[PDB]
Design a protein around this nucleic acid. Sequence first.
DNA 1: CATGAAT
DNA 2: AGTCATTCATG
DNA 3: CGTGCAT
DNA 4: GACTATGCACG
Lengths: 720, 720
Amino acid sequence: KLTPAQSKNPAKNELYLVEGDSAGGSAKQGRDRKFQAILPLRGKVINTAKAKMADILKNEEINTMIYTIGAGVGADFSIEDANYDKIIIMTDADTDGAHIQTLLLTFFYRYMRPLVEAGHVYIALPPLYKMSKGKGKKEEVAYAWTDGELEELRKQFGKGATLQRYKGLGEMNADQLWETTMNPETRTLIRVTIEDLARAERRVNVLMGDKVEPRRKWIEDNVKFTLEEATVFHMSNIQNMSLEDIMGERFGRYSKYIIQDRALPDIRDGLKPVQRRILYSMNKDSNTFDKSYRKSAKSVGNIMGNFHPHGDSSIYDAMVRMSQNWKNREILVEMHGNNGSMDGDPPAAMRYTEARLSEIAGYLLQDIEKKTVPFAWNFDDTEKEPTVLPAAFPNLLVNGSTGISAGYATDIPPHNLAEVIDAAVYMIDHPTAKIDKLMEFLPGPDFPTGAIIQGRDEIKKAYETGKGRVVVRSKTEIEKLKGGKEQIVITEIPYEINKANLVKKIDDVRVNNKVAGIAEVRDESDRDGLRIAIELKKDANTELVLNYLFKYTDLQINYNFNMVAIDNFTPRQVGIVPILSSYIAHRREVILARSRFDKEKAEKRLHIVEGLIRVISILDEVIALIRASENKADAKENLKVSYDFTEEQAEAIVTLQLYRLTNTDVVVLQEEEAELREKIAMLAAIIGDERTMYNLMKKELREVKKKFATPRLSSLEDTA
Amino acid sequence: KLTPAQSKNPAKNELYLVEGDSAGGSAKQGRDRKFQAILPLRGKVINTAKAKMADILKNEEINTMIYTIGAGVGADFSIEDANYDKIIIMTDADTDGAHIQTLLLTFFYRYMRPLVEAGHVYIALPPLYKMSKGKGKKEEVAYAWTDGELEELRKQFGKGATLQRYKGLGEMNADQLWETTMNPETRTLIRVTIEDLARAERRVNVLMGDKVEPRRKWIEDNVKFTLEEATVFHMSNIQNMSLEDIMGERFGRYSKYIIQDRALPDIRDGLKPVQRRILYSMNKDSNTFDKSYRKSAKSVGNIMGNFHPHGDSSIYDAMVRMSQNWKNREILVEMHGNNGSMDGDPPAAMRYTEARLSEIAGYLLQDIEKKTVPFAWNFDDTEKEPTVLPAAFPNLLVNGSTGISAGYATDIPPHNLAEVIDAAVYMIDHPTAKIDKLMEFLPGPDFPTGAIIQGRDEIKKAYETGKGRVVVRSKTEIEKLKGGKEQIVITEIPYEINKANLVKKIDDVRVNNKVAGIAEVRDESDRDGLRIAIELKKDANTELVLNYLFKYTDLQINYNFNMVAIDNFTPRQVGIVPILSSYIAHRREVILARSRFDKEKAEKRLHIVEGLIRVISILDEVIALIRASENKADAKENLKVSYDFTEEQAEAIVTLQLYRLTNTDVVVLQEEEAELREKIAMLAAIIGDERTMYNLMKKELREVKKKFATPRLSSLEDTA
DNA sequence: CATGAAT
DNA sequence: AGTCATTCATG
DNA sequence: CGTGCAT
DNA sequence: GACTATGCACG
Ligand SMILES: Nc1nc(-n2cc(C(=O)O)c(=O)c3cc(F)c(N4CC(O)C4)c(Cl)c32)c(F)cc1F
Ligand SMILES: Nc1nc(-n2cc(C(=O)O)c(=O)c3cc(F)c(N4CC(O)C4)c(Cl)c32)c(F)cc1F
Ligand SMILES: [Cl-]
Ligand SMILES: [Cl-]
Ligand SMILES: [Mg+2]
Ligand SMILES: [Mg+2]
Ligand SMILES: [Mg+2]
Ligand SMILES: [Mg+2]
Ligand SMILES: [Mg+2]
Ligand SMILES: [Mg+2]
């Protein structure tokens, strides 16, 4: 891990703490090996304000930092044994970078404060952009750290130029990395000072302590979800910044991003950004259900390069999960090969597997081509991506979501498609509908793992408030055997539970003989179904055993609802009512936007058809006219002046291929006129009348339900 | 690793040896867990005929194989103690599958012979193809094992529904793996017998002993490089085959594949198949030098999805190598990021790096769009790929090639572009030119790492025969110091040598004081320069030290030429003359094919233009003609039949846009006729006259030389 | 012992 | 994101 | 713990 | 191609 400097010299030597090994390789290649040491970080550093102390000192990352600094730790910290004058934190300029800077600084504040206080801890600022007027002798190369140093740089030593947009240190090489962020002549750093020991203490504890509530509160008050962030103009050479304002600039940046753009679903389409990208990318590449499977590696690589600048494993894992019918109630990806099991064994690696969108996932994307949904630039401004999908079925409830953010988490269980549509259809007709009535249609969750759900009162509370605890209990049956004996047989288990770990834990009950009567525990499951068999001993009390298992193993668990999604850019704890009204409001924007799109298209076609019908009446004249003209533009002009065609009509006439003169059937063009007028009226009516629009919204939801509805799997029971 | 059956029963229990953990999972899912155990193989198994025995008995994979079978190791081998009645080798239906089958059967024949003799060792047989689709409720599934059975299977009173072509076990769901290869009632096996103890010991020692030359010789006589092999018409449940016939077909099929299709370069373009696929795929995706870099993962994924059905890592590694200017004399891929170093420190993973083709790589692909080169069906018959690139420069000698196959290896060093071209141009003019004259132009190799090459005679022998041993010696110089001291300074090192490992091995000489005089070894290399300093003690013998280091470290090495390439589908050991002559013959085919291509295109344009000019004269009749006609097709018919236009001409007229009738400038069309006629003459002359053709071949090679020539890097010296 | 496409 | 095994030919 | 997108 | 660490919130 550690690459040391050739020469000891505590007066000038530098320890580069580099985000990741790949970048650490770059830094090792680009350094001045005489006084610059490199310690790469294996990802996310332990939180030394949350974790215990058993853990802090068994952490390999932390120990080799202490070893190398060579000053001891904490209580016994000697500043002049330190082998470095500067400790330099050099991370990607992304938000996970800011999080890493955050976690280090908290370690140094707590266990190496003499070193922070004496201004020996810095942060390297790598460039966001590198401009290149390709060639121009060598390359004509300059760098830039703000939106504003970039605008400055559009002038300068050329125009019609290349602009690379840096997403990490890993995309930089040693000469680039040296010039811009490592060489003391040229580099810009920020030195970390303490301004108030009291104020900087309260900052570190609210952000990094195990108290969640103050953190969620800090985020509520400080983080502007709705607005941007001002560019923070770049200053030359070293500059000073409080531990207080660094920790809050960086952690706020992280928090906002992981809330809005990672771990939490959108309330409308129920997708995390990575899942939305998977679906969009795969659909744009025609990787649909109707067409052939396509190697996972190809899909993943296109997603990563076009939309999602992150690991191929994170993307592949997310893709695989969307194909697992014990995780998702209505799978969005079909995958050939080993996509895992309930025993949680590894899916085949992506070289092996192949994939495509499910039929139903087609319906989340339905009408995306008709400007139904806001798009934005991808990470490199090469390409647009949807911020939300059309969502012709209410995926959030149907498939649920489970995620862990900053200040917030979420748990939304899967639900029955038909039931969720039923509720939504009622609510379209009854905007003020209350829970009691909605639950006649949506009585509760419907896990793809089935089993028994207990706590009708608590479902109600979760559907009211977004929170509640419910009991999920495996489905069981007794069977008789040789010697009169019994065995408990398990056929459905609780959501999110590992079958093999459950079996093991039951077998440990047997072994430790916590309850009298267990003979043997066999998993007898196979490719066709789940079946765990708990063979009992001669005359053992079936009931006493079963009840011990439910109590003391995960044969029975509590599901805790915690229904948080993103609504108007803000995290938001929500019950069934805001969830369904948001969906409905969404489909309304979609159906109206789709209607406007198709209507504008029909109008243009109608104006042309009108034109073509007229041209046939004067075809001989139109052709002589075109022959008499000098060029295209002149022909169009003549057509307008002589015969009052529009620009649109004239352009269309003038670009007809000669063979089109073979079809001059005006009757057929008149049937098409009538059909277009009919259609424009229908579409106008939708845009003109909310109820006409809502009736369509319901018609479509019903079609979906008819096509994709499947029986409930989880049974419901009132008392818990 | 091992997943055991639930119930002991040496009568019918089965051990599945599956190729890969991913297929091992697939098998663990699809099994009958009562009697089928799963041992997954971590790829290529140790060769038991070659390895020591110290090394064999410490192989984790073998140890867990003898522990599980529970009988001991040949001699101590108690067949009556066996935990299984069938041992079933389950590998992919690819050539590396056949290789593993080969490697295990040597282990069993050699350390467990009673098992093989009793017919307790079986083979996988998984299906090559799967047929049909009725979609959600399908009743449309049928598996097939041969070419013959597929045609048979395409008949079915229904439609042409969809065909899947399996490439391994990774792509089969647990359901399909059971029905086809794991259920005893349905599956097909090969039982392995020893028909002749004598003939099966000759066959296993020829294929798997230390002796290469017998294996080479076996391959020469038995393996047909220019022919196919017509499938073994498939039988039912169990079938017997001798250990002699199995090892022979299995290893013959692997051997052939890795000679022709993996490890050995094509004599014309100098590329291994993976390199060609990288170049072609990247070029097809417009991932060229002139356009933006593009994420490596995206490149790799499309290579894997479209052309190369192998691991992402093997593809990235190959791709990365082509970017490294200390491995390739003229790099074929440009790569932003950590693409390694001379210290062999790992490159950034493909998630970080981004790449494109170099400019000169463009010259390998020059004129691929012009039917200059034979294409084949890719691996899943969905898309065509080139079997060889145009190669507008002689890449085989320029970038060389280093590979290991079966019976053969290759070692072709890099050469200087200008010099190879000079030799090639001379030989175009002098087909009979002999080595002494060619070496005036091409005196020897030019390593990208420079250094000093010693051995004119041996160069000559390599250039004559394909084989030769030369000395490659680091470039050194002696620098004076303070206080009566010298240091040796190394500035270039031998090709293929890891700088850090060399520095280490020199330092260990100091530490063990194997030779006296070394004060310190210091790698003083930076981003700009290679510089190693061996500082010597006051009054040490510097000649004695330097000579010790040359002899006993890699400060100097032997390079052994072993110039083997694929010539006409067969491996061939070749000197400079057959190498250069193959290149010139290839360029001839390319230039001729190109010229035909461009001429057919110019002739078509010309006929169309003749047609357009003629049309003017009959515009009114043409137009009237076109309105009368029933459709496009009919209109063309009348044009031909009435007016004696060709199909090409009629198609062009009938698709003119109406505004083209404004234009009556026959003169510009006539300038174009004339220019096309000139060009058709130039091109026909190239096709018609070998010297015209060869003179063009020379003109282009000189252009490439002028554009891309660089100075020699390695110096040459006559005395070893 | 290490080279480079493969498992 | 870095580790760890094997094949094959060769000196 | 173990969940699931990230480093 | 498997294996190992971390953050974040929540029972
Ligand atoms: N589990 C399995 N792995 C491999 N395999 C594949 C590698 C690759 O695709 O580039 C690789 O680099 C690799 C390195 C190894 F060090 C290695 N081993 C360490 C031991 O566990 C074996 C193995 Cl095995 C490796 C395989 F080809 C097949 C597998 F099932
Ligand atoms: N070297 C570095 N690795 C990681 N990293 C990335 C993983 C991924 O992309 O999916 C992963 O699955 C992963 C698992 C680990 F168990 C793990 N650790 C075991 C310890 O050595 C740390 C690390 Cl660190 C892991 C990183 F994100 C950044 C890295 F530099
Ligand atoms: Cl039209
Ligand atoms: Cl034209
Ligand atoms: Mg990153
Ligand atoms: Mg991972
Ligand atoms: Mg419990
Ligand atoms: Mg394979
Ligand atoms: Mg590898
Ligand atoms: Mg030597």
